[PDB]
Amino acid sequence: SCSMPLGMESKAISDAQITASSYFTNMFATWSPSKARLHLQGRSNAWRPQVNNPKEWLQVDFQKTMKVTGVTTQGVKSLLTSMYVKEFLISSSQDGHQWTLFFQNGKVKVFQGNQDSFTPVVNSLDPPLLTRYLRIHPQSWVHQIALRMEVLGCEA
Numbered sequence: 001s002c003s004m005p006l007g008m009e010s011k012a013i014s015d016a017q018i019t020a021s022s023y024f025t026n027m028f029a030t031w032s033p034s035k036a037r038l039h040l041q042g043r044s045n046a047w048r049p050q051v052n053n054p055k056e057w058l059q060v061d062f063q064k065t066m067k068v069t070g071v072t073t074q075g076v077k078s079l080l081t082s083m084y085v086k087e088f089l090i091s092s093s094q095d096g097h098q099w100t101l102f103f104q105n106g107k108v109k110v111f112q113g114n115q116d117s118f119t120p121v122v123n124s125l126d127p128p129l130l131t132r133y134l135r136i137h138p139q140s141w142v143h144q145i146a147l148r149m150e151v152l153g154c155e156a
């Protein structure tokens with residue numbers, strides 16, 4: 001009863017609500033944070049950071065506190081090149097300034113993500129996370145960091 005998609009795919013979460021540490025842009029594509037939407041199609045259809053390393057993150061602002069019970073991630077196939085995140089951390093905030101890493105079994109939870117570019121993987125957050133902001137912190141990846149996502153939950 002609390003696993004509704006919050007709006008990444010449907011665009012109920014608007015472009016302005018999605019930001020990142022950095023993003024990659026060249027003459028070919030602009031891999032903006034707001035392209036990080038599950039199942040999005042087109043030439044620029046994922047978020048990619050400017051550089052590949054664990055200091056990078058993607059942020060969503062729900063603009064009120066929500067109950068988050070899951071996140072869904074996907075990579076992207078760009079031309080003939082597979083790109084996906086294999087492992088990631090989550091952090092959260094109510095005020096946008098002070099952040100908290102999601103813990104499980106006594107340590108920061110390392111979420112196991114994707115195994116290809118195109119198939120979604122759902123990761124449950126237990127206990128549920130009550131938060132206004134959510135950040136995803138890629139830790140490992142195949143070839144390049146690329147993300148399309150969804151957030152699952154309900155009202156706080």
Ligand SMILES: N=c1n(CCN2CCCCC2)c2ccccc2n1C[C@@H](O)COc1ccc(Cl)cc1Cl
Binds near residue numbers: 054139142
């Ligand atoms: N997790 C990664 N990291 C950093 C995250 N890690 C924790 C710190 C040490 C390295 C793993 C990578 C850095 C550069 C390149 C790949 C990285 N990965 C994913 C790598 O762990 C494995 O991914 C690959 C598999 C096949 C090919 Cl052809 C290419 C790649 Cl990249």
